[PDB]
Design an enzyme around this catalytic site. Structure first.
Site, PDB file in Angstrom:
ATOM      1  CB  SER A 125      -3.048  -4.634  -0.719  1.00 21.20           C
ATOM      2  OG  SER A 125      -3.249  -5.078  -2.046  1.00 21.20           O
ATOM      3  N   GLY A 126      -2.115  -7.591  -1.277  1.00 20.10           N
ATOM      4  CA  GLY A 126      -1.253  -8.689  -1.637  1.00 20.10           C
ATOM      5  C   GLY A 126      -1.318  -9.868  -0.699  1.00 20.10           C
TER       6      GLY A 126
ATOM      7  CB  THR B  95      -8.968 -10.184  -5.018  1.00 12.76           C
ATOM      8  OG1 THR B  95      -8.588  -8.804  -4.980  1.00 12.76           O
ATOM      9  CG2 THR B  95      -9.833 -10.434  -6.235  1.00 12.76           C
TER      10      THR B  95
ATOM     11  CG  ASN C  37       2.326  -4.387  -1.664  1.00  7.64           C
ATOM     12  OD1 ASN C  37       2.795  -5.099  -2.545  1.00  7.64           O
ATOM     13  ND2 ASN C  37       1.285  -4.748  -0.929  1.00  7.64           N
TER      14      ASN C  37
ATOM     15  CB  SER D 110      -0.909  -0.579  -1.955  1.00  3.76           C
ATOM     16  OG  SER D 110      -1.564  -0.197  -0.764  1.00  3.76           O
ATOM     17  CB  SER D 111      -6.658  -1.617  -2.720  1.00  3.40           C
ATOM     18  OG  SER D 111      -6.604  -2.609  -3.726  1.00  3.40           O
TER      19      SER D 111
ATOM     20  N   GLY E  39      -5.414  -2.480   6.228  1.00  2.00           N
ATOM     21  CA  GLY E  39      -5.093  -2.521   7.636  1.00  2.00           C
ATOM     22  C   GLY E  39      -4.256  -1.359   8.126  1.00  2.00           C
TER      23      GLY E  39
ATOM     24  CD  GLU F 127       0.209   2.232   4.657  1.00  2.00           C
ATOM     25  OE1 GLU F 127       0.274   3.475   4.598  1.00  2.00           O
ATOM     26  OE2 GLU F 127      -0.199   1.527   3.711  1.00  2.00           O
TER      27      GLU F 127
END
Ligand SMILES: Nc1ncnc2c1ncn2[C@@H]1O[C@H](COP(=O)(O)OP(=O)(O)NP(=O)(O)O)[C@@H](O)[C@H]1O
Ligand SMILES: Nc1ncnc2c1ncn2[C@@H]1O[C@H](COP(=O)(O)OP(=O)(O)O)[C@@H](O)[C@H]1O
Ligand SMILES: [Mg+2]
Ligand SMILES: [Mg+2]
Ligand SMILES: [Mg+2]
Lengths: 372, 739, 7, 139
Positions: free
Chosen positions: B156-157, B161, B202, B205-206, B428, B430
């Site tokens: 994420s990041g 989106t 992060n 993070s979703s 993804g 991790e």
């Protein structure tokens, strides 16, 4: 998927249900009835014999046989009716499709567990099964790996010490005192007050009296002195016909026989001394940790006050520096079943089952070596 | 051999994961390579490997990373680097996968004229762009009436989106246009506020899978949108590891406490509450969390959550924090009781419309019923805490599902979808310096998706091999199934973990010992760290990962006592609280079991559908526009499984050329019969290539070797001409020299 | 049982 | 080489002497060999020269007597055509492509050398008859 059945044969109540749920959904007495009278009405649907809750609905006209006496199965043909009724009528689940878990007291004739296995494979085609000791299962049911389990149902009483999940076979004690023999004594003491219960139906009425009104006196002697000296103990109970019967010192006096089997003429000392004498058969490193947990199991332990009587008089026997703690969860009547429900759902246990393959290879002899 | 003077190789280096060197003297088979570098250095050839060769400059920079005649980490890293820095091209194809690098800066490419230019184009003809994924899914749905999916994977990041946003803009415009994209994009502020947490690496993070369905009518006009969510990380609500936070909404709610409307909740300093406290890190830098809530409440308004419901939700979450503050005193080893007039419970009961003296009882007892009778019995302080924490996890996951359904109510249509396309934003693979139950769940999910991917690729290559009539036996499935079996089979790590929960006196030591007894020399993929007995190592597809055991029996436990739920359903004070629960085994399922079930509901929702894969990678930490760092890139290419996918394709026939293209390149060496000779002329191992109807298929090495001999032939011809022409010019200059 | 008792 | 050949070659060598000392530079040896009918590569010239370093290649001077063994050592059509057909199969060659390869590949020449040799051989399309160009450069 598929889930084990878990069965506890007991005496008095059979209790059975599926593994991995909280309480048995079939609980009913292990009792078989046959009609004894002349049948008058043609066209009734007259029926040869009755099992479980039916036999106690009709008990007025029935002889009631118990097929299990002192954890031994004495009558096989009537035992099979009970199992057949359990699986097909009570659970409504065909036994071909489910492993089955069966429960037994220790130190009892091996022919019993052999034939109990043979019936499950040959008559029901149960895919796999196992036989477990009631004491062991009570610890799973109370969440311990260490304790001395005092277990008493109907029929047999037994102590088993367990320490970190090792049993100690030489320390196991077995006593026949519990259960029905309290009732067969109570019927005699009630005769002193001018009530007579002879029939096997009346036996079940006394069995209800005992469950409602009996309790254990902390000091036996002062409560006899008191109930001799006053009516203030006295309580009265309504029979199935609307007669009323009244009971005084008998209602504590009956469970007291658990602590003094001399009353009924049994040879050997009461459960406090067999529990202590069982701990004294254990090597001295573990006694502290058995004294710290004593787990009471099965229905006979349910008499009000029994925990505090045990804890008191064992604290009289034990050396004074130790904590005696008596552990008596309010649910303990079911503990053997709840513990079998936990055990049968562990993944590690899936290797333990006796499978039909091994029975067909080696015959019912296998039970002794594969099971405990 | 392949190693010659004027060869080029990659040498490993810490400065950049690989750097180029030139082979300064021919290697022969032993223990030094004479190398030259951007000046002298010597590189031991050591047991064992040889250094990997460098792709020739015809191939370097091409759009499709599987047109490379060596397929290995530095080659890919180099091609992405040069395409990103030198072209400013972000998107690239790897095989079937699109790779999409985050620039940190807006680019002009997205305009509607480009959307039009991509309409009707096959992927391969285009320069890769996300509109090529959107289009080839849309027109596959049009061709063949099966739903399509899009899958977006990464840290994420890395802009997941934005890839969603531009995909649904594409769908809107090539459909023509229900104003769906606006309402959908208005969902993100709340679905982040509830959905995201800081993590040790992060921010934002979703933690949950998100799925969007865009429905289409029989015209292929956009009908409407429907959102699903899966794989929610419930365990975060009650527990965090150091340098982490709870889901953002709790801190937004706390910093809001200065506002008058939230006066009644008595929300304290964010470090006042046990669920916020534990990460030790109340304030993110570069965020005003008070200002975030002004966005959240607006998105709630503009999706049609009533003003009444917003104050219901913030009541419920204040409830959760106050519940977490509840404290139990043990009165005996078996039995515990809440202190008399304990203020946290008083406030929770006031917030939530229940009697103090009912919750005070039910938090400290649990009830069992046979068919005939019931027993109410005490429970230990540990069971009371596990019950309270399961109650908070159950409230939170029911609130989250309610908010999602109240968004679908805002996005659903009367006209029902004849078919849909689906967009999946998912985390993804991790790995952190510590690994814990959350990382185990995430990595297991990714192993399931990577299975699905390998199966879909094997499908496609079986089709392409029948089209060109090359028999499948020459390719083989690479199977990760043993690693899934290690985790989820009977007597797998999750199975033994659920066993060790219900087992009496279950502890993370006895759990680890059961793992080692079961697997330690029975399975190739499971290993024990050499110095520790509290940890274990799983070889996943991406990497080896070492997990600590020390958390899992805290986190895996869930059970909720229906009595407490029946206390909450009884509440009269406001509608939302009984509304949450309304819709008996599930109360007993562990988190690992609920996770594995949610992951099946996902894998059937994607087996229902035909996927398309996007991968996103985040090339630096400081958000520097169009800067690239090998040390982040190598990590993220690995966390996206791209580097296995490349290794597997290199175990195939990765490079394939049409006859025209080959003949046009290699006439210098010398239609189908022609090339069919020329390969036997130039290659001795028939295994190295296969013929097909329109194509030739090469094993990985061959095309660079053919380029090498072509360049050498051209070199010789050039030098022969060069010397003879220069010599004639020298004979002419000799007459000049006389003159 | 078989000897020392009735069952 | 016979006496007449040795005399003609020495005279030619002296023509390359830009200082009057009867000597040429190492860097001229190849030029003299090419003027004398040899077609050595730059590599062959440096090898017979003994792979000289830059400094002696640019400033060290050698007389005929040391050059002669080198000329001998270097001394001791269809390929040329195929070599041109490399850059083609209609018998033509782009002027841009031949220029690029001759100035960028192999033993790269200057743009002026390539313009000089290519002058008049390319047509309006920018195609060179390479068989004719080859005969021209071999004469
Ligand atoms: N492909 C891209 N094109 C343009 N801007 C991008 C791109 N990827 C990222 N950004 C920008 O970089 C930042 C991070 O992307 P963003 O979409 O905000 O990620 P995100 O919100 O964290 N999605 P997620 O990680 O799933 O929560 C934002 O400021 C974006 O504008
Ligand atoms: N509440 C009670 N108080 C005293 N005795 C009870 C109570 N409930 C059951 N019993 C007696 O306990 C016996 C049944 O015990 P149980 O544990 O069901 O047997 P089993 O061990 O075979 O299951 C019967 O004699 C019954 O009368
Ligand atoms: Mg029993
Ligand atoms: Mg996002
Ligand atoms: Mg963003």
């Amino acid at each position: 998927e598929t889930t084990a059945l878990v069965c506890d044969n007991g005496s008095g109540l059979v209790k059975a249900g599926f593994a991995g749920d909280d309480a048995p959904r079939a609980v009913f007495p292990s009792i078989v009835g046959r009609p004894r009278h002349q049948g008058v009405m043609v066209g009734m649907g007259q029926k040869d014999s009755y099992v479980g809750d039916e036999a106690q609905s009709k008990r007025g006209i029935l002889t009631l046989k118990y097929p299990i006496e002192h954890g031994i199965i004495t009558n096989w043909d009537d035992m099979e009716k009970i199992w057949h009724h359990t699986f097909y009528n009570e659970l409504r689940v065909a036994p071909e499709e489910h492993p089955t878990l069966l429960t037994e007291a220790p130190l009892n004739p091996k022919a019993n567990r052999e034939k109990m296995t043979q019936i499950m494979f040959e008559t029901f085609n149960v895919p796999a099964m196992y036989v477990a000791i009631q004491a062991v299962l009570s610890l799973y049911a109370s969440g311990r790996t260490t304790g001395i389990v005092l277990d008493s149902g109907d029929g047999v009483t037994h102590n088993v010490p367990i320490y970190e999940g090792y049993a100690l076979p030489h320390a196991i004690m077995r006593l026949d005192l519990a259960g029905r023999d309290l009732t067969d004594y109570l019927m005699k003491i009630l005769t002193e007050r001018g009530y007579s219960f002879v029939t096997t139906a009346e036996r079940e009425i006394v069995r209800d009296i005992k469950e409602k009104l009996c309790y254990v006196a902390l000091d036996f002697e002062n409560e006899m002195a008191t109930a001799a000296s006053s009516s203030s103990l006295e309580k009265s109970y309504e029979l199935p016909d609307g007669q009323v019967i009244t009971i005084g010192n008998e209602r504590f006096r009956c469970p007291e026989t658990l602590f003094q089997p001399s009353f009924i003429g049994m040879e050997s000392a009461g459960i406090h001394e067999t529990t202590y004498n069982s701990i004294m058969k254990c090597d001295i490193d573990i006694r502290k940790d058995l004294y710290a947990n004593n787990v009471m199991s099965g229905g006979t332990t349910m008499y009000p006050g029994i925990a505090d009587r045990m804890q008191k008089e064992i604290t009289a026997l034990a050396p004074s520096t130790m904590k005696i703690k008596i552990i008596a969860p309010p649910e303990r009547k079911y503990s053997v079943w709840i513990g079998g429900s936990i055990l049968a759902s562990l993944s590690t246990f899936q290797q333990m089952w006796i499978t039909k393959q091994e029975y067909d290879e080696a015959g019912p002899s296998i039970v002794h070596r594969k099971c405990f | 051999e392949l190693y010659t003077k004027y060869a080029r190789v990659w040498i490993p280096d810490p400065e950049e994961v690989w750097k180029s060197a030139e082979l300064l003297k021919d290697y022969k088979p032993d223990k030094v390579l004479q190398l030259r570098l951007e000046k002298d250095l010597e590189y031991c050839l050591d047991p064992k490997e040889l250094p990997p060769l460098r792709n020739p400059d015809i191939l370097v920079g091409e759009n499709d990373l599987t047109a490379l005649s060596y397929l290995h980490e530095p080659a890919v890293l180099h091609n992405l680097k040069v395409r990103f820095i030198d072209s400013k091209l972000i998107y690239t194809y790897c095989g079937i996968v699109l790779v999409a690098i985050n620039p940190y800066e807006q680019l002009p490419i997205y305009g509607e004229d480009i959307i039009n230019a991509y309409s009707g184009q096959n992927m391969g003809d285009m320069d890769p762009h996300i509109f090529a994924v959107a289009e080839e899914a849309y027109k596959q749905m049009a061709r063949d009436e099966r739903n399509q999916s899009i899958i977006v994977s990464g840290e994420s990041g890395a802009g997941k989106t934005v890839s969603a946003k531009y995909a649904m803009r594409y769908f809107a415009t090539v459909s023509g246009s229900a104003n769906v994209e606006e309402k959908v994009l208005a969902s993100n502020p709340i679905m982040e506020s509830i959905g995201n947490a800081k993590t040790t690496r992060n921010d934002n993070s979703s933690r949950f899978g998100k799925y969007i369905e865009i429905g289409f009518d029989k015209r292929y006009r956009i009908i409407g949108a429907n959102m699903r969510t899966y794989l929610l990380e419930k365990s975060r609500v009650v527990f965090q590891a150091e340098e982490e936070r709870n889901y953002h909404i709790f801190y937004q709610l706390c910093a809001s406490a200065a506002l008058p409307e939230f006066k009644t909740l008595r929300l304290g300093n964010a470090n006042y509450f046990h669920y916020t406290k534990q990460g030790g890190s109340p304030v993110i830098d570069g965020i005003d969390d008070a200002k975030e809530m002004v966005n959240t409440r607006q998105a709630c308004t503009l999706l049609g959550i009533s003003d009444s419901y917003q104050m219901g939700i913030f009541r419920i979450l204040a409830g959760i924090l106050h519940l977490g503050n509840v404290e139990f005193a043990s009165r005996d080893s078996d039995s515990c009781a809440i202190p008399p007039k304990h203020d946290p419970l008083t406030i929770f009961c006031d917030l939530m419309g229940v009697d103090y003296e009912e919750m005070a009882h039910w938090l400290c007892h649990r009830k069992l019923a046979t068919a005939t009778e019931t027993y109410i019995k005490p429970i230990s302080k540990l069971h009371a805490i596990n019950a309270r924490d399961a109650l908070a996890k159950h409230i939170y996951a029911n609130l989250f599902n309610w908010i999602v359904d109240h968004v679908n109510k805002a996005l659903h249509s009367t006209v029902k979808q004849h078919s849909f396309i689906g967009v999946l934003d998912i985390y993804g693979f991790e790995t952190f310096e510590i690994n814990s139950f959350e990382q185990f769940c995430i990595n297991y999910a990714n192993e399931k998706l990577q299975q699905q991917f390998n199966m879909h690729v094997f499908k496609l290559e079986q089709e392409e091999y029948m089209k060109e009539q090359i028999p499948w036996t020459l390719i083989d499935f690479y199977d990760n199934q043993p690693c899934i079996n290690l985790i989820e089979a009977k007597m797998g790590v999750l199975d033994l973990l659920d066993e060790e929960c219900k087992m009496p006196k279950g502890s993370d030591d006895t759990w680890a010992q059961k793992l080692y007894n079961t697997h330690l020399n029975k399975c190739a993929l499971f290993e024990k760290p050499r110095l520790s007995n509290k940890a274990f190592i799983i070889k996943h597809f991406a990497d080896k990962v070492e997990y600590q055991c020390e958390g899992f029996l805290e986190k895996n436990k869930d059970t909720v006592y229906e009595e407490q739920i029946k206390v909450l359903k009884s509440s009269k004070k406001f509608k939302l609280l009984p509304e949450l629960f309304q819709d008996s085994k599930e109360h007993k399922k562990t988190v690992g079991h609920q996770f594995r079930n949610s992951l099946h509901l996902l894998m059937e929702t994607l087996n229902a559908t035909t996927p398309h894969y996007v991968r996103c990678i985040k090339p630096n930490d400081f958000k520097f526009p169009f800067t690239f760092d090998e040390k982040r890139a190598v990590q993220q290419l690995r966390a996206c499984g791209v580097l296995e996918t490349i290794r597997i394709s290199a175990a195939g026939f990765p490079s394939r050329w049409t006859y025209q293209e080959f003949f046009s390149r290699y006439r210098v060496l010398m239609r189908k019969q022609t090339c069919k000779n020329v390969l036997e002329k130039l290659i001795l191992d028939k295994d190295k290539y296969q013929f097909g109807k329109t194509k030739i298929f090469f094993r990985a090495g061959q095309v660079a070797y053919l380029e090498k001999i072509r360049a050498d032939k051209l070199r010789a011809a050039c030098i022969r001409i060069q010397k003879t022409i220069r010599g004639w010019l020298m004979r002419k200059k000799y007459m000049r020299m006389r003159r | 049982w078989x000897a020392x008792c009735p069952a | 080489f016979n006496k007449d050949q040795l005399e003609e070659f020495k005279e030619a060598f002296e023509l390359f002497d830009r200082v009057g000392d009867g000597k040429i530079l190492y860097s001229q040896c190849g030029d003299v060999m090419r003027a004398l009918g040899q077609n050595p590569t730059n590599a062959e010239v440096l090898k017979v020269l003994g792979n000289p370093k830059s400094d002696e290649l640019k400033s060290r001077r050698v007389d005929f007597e040391t050059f002669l063994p080198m000329l001998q050592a270097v001394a001791k059509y269809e390929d040329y055509l195929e070599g041109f057909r490399v850059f083609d199969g209609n018998g033509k060659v782009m002027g841009a492509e031949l220029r690029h390869v001759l100035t960028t590949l192999g033993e790269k020449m200057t743009e002026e050398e390539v313009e000089t040799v290519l002058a008049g051989h390319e047509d309006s399309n920018g195609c060179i008859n390479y068989e004719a160009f080859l005969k021209h450069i071999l004469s």
